Symmetry: D2
Subunit: 286 residues, 4 copies
């Protein structure tokens, strides 16, 4: 049974996880959120923001590979990548594996998250922050995108790796119908966006809001989920595309693109892509 | 609420992780000779059956579990006529299996009459009448003894479904998860039979999962592994399907849909596309 | 068990400390217009009344609370004939006060009819029939309004006992803990009357305790403070006794015992020596 | 509500405390027990052994003053003091305050507890370990007492500050009828012993065992309790005496002896002594 020291991770308000803690590496009240870096018995080292595990050593690859590779593999030639959020650097790490990428920008609002990850979560970033193709910008992603529209900047793939749409005050403006209209303005004609969208089982209304926002703005929309043990649920992802349909990829085409681009993964393959494209998302059935 | 409450179920998960689940009502607590049984209403999952602290089934998500346990195996078999279920005390596994119009006879064997009776009384949306279907027979007995008696009598089944308490926590079910038990199961199958069992969770209990897998593989030439997230359990349940002839990997979505239609099977979840996803999604393991 | 369960009450204590208490059964849940009410069986404390997540009373330790609230005040008064109780919805305060043979009239005023009725039905060992004693009258009303009406009518009492929800957590009771309310209480006491109230807990809620104390002291020339550990609450409840004439500190153990004997009062806990200890034990405060 | 990081402190098996934690300073698996030093929001810094708070900054004085001063004040002239347990050094600190004390020996089985206290709990020991009157011995108190009998050592006051009689395997032999017969052999003819005895409300059987042990061996026995918020209950103490009755000591004589001996306290006074001597201990009443 978990203890003596335990993290109470909120899930739905009516369910939480109790997770044994072995050590606390750092506690920082930043201007934006409470940050803890801790060792858990089940999941190894974790980043926690306002009580929610954002990433764990033992299962973060399931999350980051699922967030990044379906979108990147769908795009025939992703050269410019924008990541909103992704403060521990693992999203950036996965995107940089695509040999086609020439420029990857990561924008997180919270310098303290980036710095504590640099120091305490080396297996997350694995040096991604210092890749010559990468640029790390500390700024509200909302301001960054408004500035990108003014400058006429364009991206092939935009990946949103933010705090949850059902809980997070700092991320709330980035999940609106209006924000997705802005995202479309900073994509190339054939660009793709992907975002995590919370959980459709526990937070259907907030999930549906994100979905309706993507659908209003993108003609091709794919929905898929993956169980992340440390979060207590299957994270929902929503992929919006302007031209290329992730459903049209065979396993063999996915594997071919990963091979050609030199991408090694612990999880994502062509067969995983096929399963993600065929598995309906969970909803409360009664 | 950060801490669900004021009344809460602490559901064990790994020993290092548990779920805290708000409870609205407790309908029955019964210490049976075999296990502690609670029937309760939860805010998130509706009514649940709990055995020794583990939710076995919830109103809002049980169809994910029971449809995943039953339909891949039944759809793989071109003509399942005789079905044996070990466990499945709330009656939902029986309910799913009986939907296959090809089934002529279904036997369900549970060790614990108190579970069956509390289900009869408190869980109508689980059994949905399945206990009293003229095709069905409910036998109260240790599934180990039942199978030994079946071998002696020369009984044979097309599909055997094991819906037991977990291999990592359950003393009463532990003998049914052995290499030797699966050799007995094979003795009560037809030459083209299929078995399916839940096998706990490969992420949190890899050693116990691996033991069950090794046991199935020792005894069956075709073995498919798949998992489905069951919110009320806190994890993706692992299933292992063992087959003597027919490969579930060979079925297209449209063949699955065709067989379900022909057999009159209606589901809330399982379809041909779900089948394809189950067959292609690798199971979760701790990666570091 | 390190984590009590499987079904558990999370009882708030300070906001930074809570109690986890194993539950065996839930007898009743009622969302009343005033508060959420649960009657439940706990393993450690037997049956409990819970209001908004806080145990108000338990079978195994309620006598510590009710005897401590009632007897020091009643024993201090040489001849309590008329008693008013504000709160005390389970009826145990009324039960203790009625034990004094001198009492001719006892009024109990609770704002929440659902608490009184559920206690009547599910907590018989609390009221023990007190609600139907010919000396008693049960009035359903906000104690604030009742006292305003008592002042208008010129009603007078010997002993007023306040058995309310906590001053640190309870919106419904908050107006009854003010300096102005205690001035009203004094207006419905005889010239030699006494009031007693529980005042939360000075260790975890010192500011709210201090506010109640300063309110009593503004209005009464004699003020005694005492506390008693109530296991089911997780802390030592603080009581504040305000008196117009008679000093509880002046009472010898022998005089307490003699008054209890003469009045036919039998107790499980309170005696003259307990009174001496209550009068000499300082209340707990955080020391660093 | 407590969290996100929480200590689950066991109480009865059917009740536990959930306590918010702010920091973890040290975790050490010693040969004898698991040790944690942590900061709690409600109780400040704590020493935890096998999941039970042994001492907290904000309330430890209630425990240590209650354990030590009734016994020491009852003895008209305590010169030699033996403490079994008391690894954080607070019991030693309280006993040394008595100006009459010439020699105070503290025997704890677990060097790691003493060393972590030295490092992390300065407000507990307050220098007591290095007082010239004090001697710290690392040893099982059972063996130490057997050796004291062989050497013919004698003490005025023996204070037992061990882990609980209802939970602790390492301390179990020190709570027996036979152990108290040994304790009597290393007391002067007017000596006194005092021990904590768990809790009579939640653990009546184990309390009754300790009481029967003391009563078998000492003609005067006083029982008293004090609520220690951080433990979740009123600790029971049992004081055994060969000559002097703590019941006979008046508030004014207690105050006089404390003054004469230069003892300053945050809690214990003559009136507290009177209350402790008159308050019956808690039991389940139904
Ligand atoms: C750890 S992955 C989630 C990240 O999203 C970042 N985040 C939250 N809201 C915003 C925002 N409005 N703009 C950019 N990053 C954000 C958080 O600082 C966190 O590091
Ligand atoms: C509720 S689904 C799990 C069911 O498996 C049942 N079960 C556990 N062990 C055995 C066994 N050895 N034989 C038959 N049923 C069992 C339990 O009684 C439960 O009803
Ligand atoms: C169970 S003892 C506490 C009781 O105080 C009662 N109470 C709380 N606030 C008030 C109030 N303003 N007037 C009268 N009774 C009250 C509550 O209904 C509860 O039954
Ligand atoms: C912190 S106070 C309790 C102390 O009692 C000590 N203790 C427990 N059992 C024994 C024993 N058998 N002999 C000496 N000390 C002990 C523990 O190491 C702890 O430091
Ligand atoms: N426990 C939860 N509810 N977690 C939600 C975390 C997902 C937000 N991205 C963070 C992952 C960073 N790569
Ligand atoms: N909470 C859990 N770990 N549950 C284990 C799942 C129960 C397996 N058979 C019962 C399913 C009902 N037919
Ligand atoms: N924190 C707590 N658990 N407090 C409950 C205190 C009881 C106040 N009403 C009186 C109790 C019923 N007579
Ligand atoms: N259940 C509990 N929390 N009990 C801890 C009691 C501490 C016993 N001796 C150590 C006291 C510190 N000197």
């Amino acid at each position: 049974v978990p203890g003596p020291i335990t993290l109470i991770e909120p899930l739905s308000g009516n369910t939480s996880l109790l997770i044994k803690i072995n050590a606390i590496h750092s506690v920082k009240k930043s201007p934006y959120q409470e940050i803890i870096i801790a060792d858990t018995e089940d999941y190894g080292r974790v980043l926690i923001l306002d009580d929610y595990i954002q990433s764990s050593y033992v299962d973060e690859q399931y999350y980051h590979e699922s967030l990044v590779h379906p979108a990147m593999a769908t795009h025939p030639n992703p050269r410019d990548v924008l990541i909103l959020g992704g403060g521990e650097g693992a999203t950036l790490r996965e995107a940089l594996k695509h040999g086609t990428v020439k420029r990857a920008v990561m924008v997180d609002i919270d310098r303290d998250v980036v710095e504590l990850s640099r120091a305490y979560l080396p297996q997350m970033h694995q040096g991604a922050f210092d890749d010559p193709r990468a640029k790390v910008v500390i700024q509200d992603g909302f301001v960054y995108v408004e500035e990108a529209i003014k400058a006429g900047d364009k991206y092939d793939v935009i990946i949103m790796d933010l705090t949850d749409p059902y809980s997070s005050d700092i991320a709330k403006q980035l999940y609106t119908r209006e924000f997705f209209a802005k995202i479309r303005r900073i994509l190339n004609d054939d660009g793709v966006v992907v975002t995590q969208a919370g959980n459709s089982f526990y937070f259907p209304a907030e999930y549906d809001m994100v979905l309706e926002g993507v659908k209003a703005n993108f003609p091709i929309v794919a929905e898929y989920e993956v169980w992340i043990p440390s979060f207590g649920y299957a994270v929902n992802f929503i992929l919006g595309s302007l031209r290329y349909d992730p459903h049209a990829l065979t396993p063999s085409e996915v594997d071919e693109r990963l091979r050609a681009r030199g991408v090694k993964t612990a999880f994502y393959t062509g067969r995983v892509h096929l399963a993600l494209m065929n598995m309906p998302i969970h909803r409360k059935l009664r």
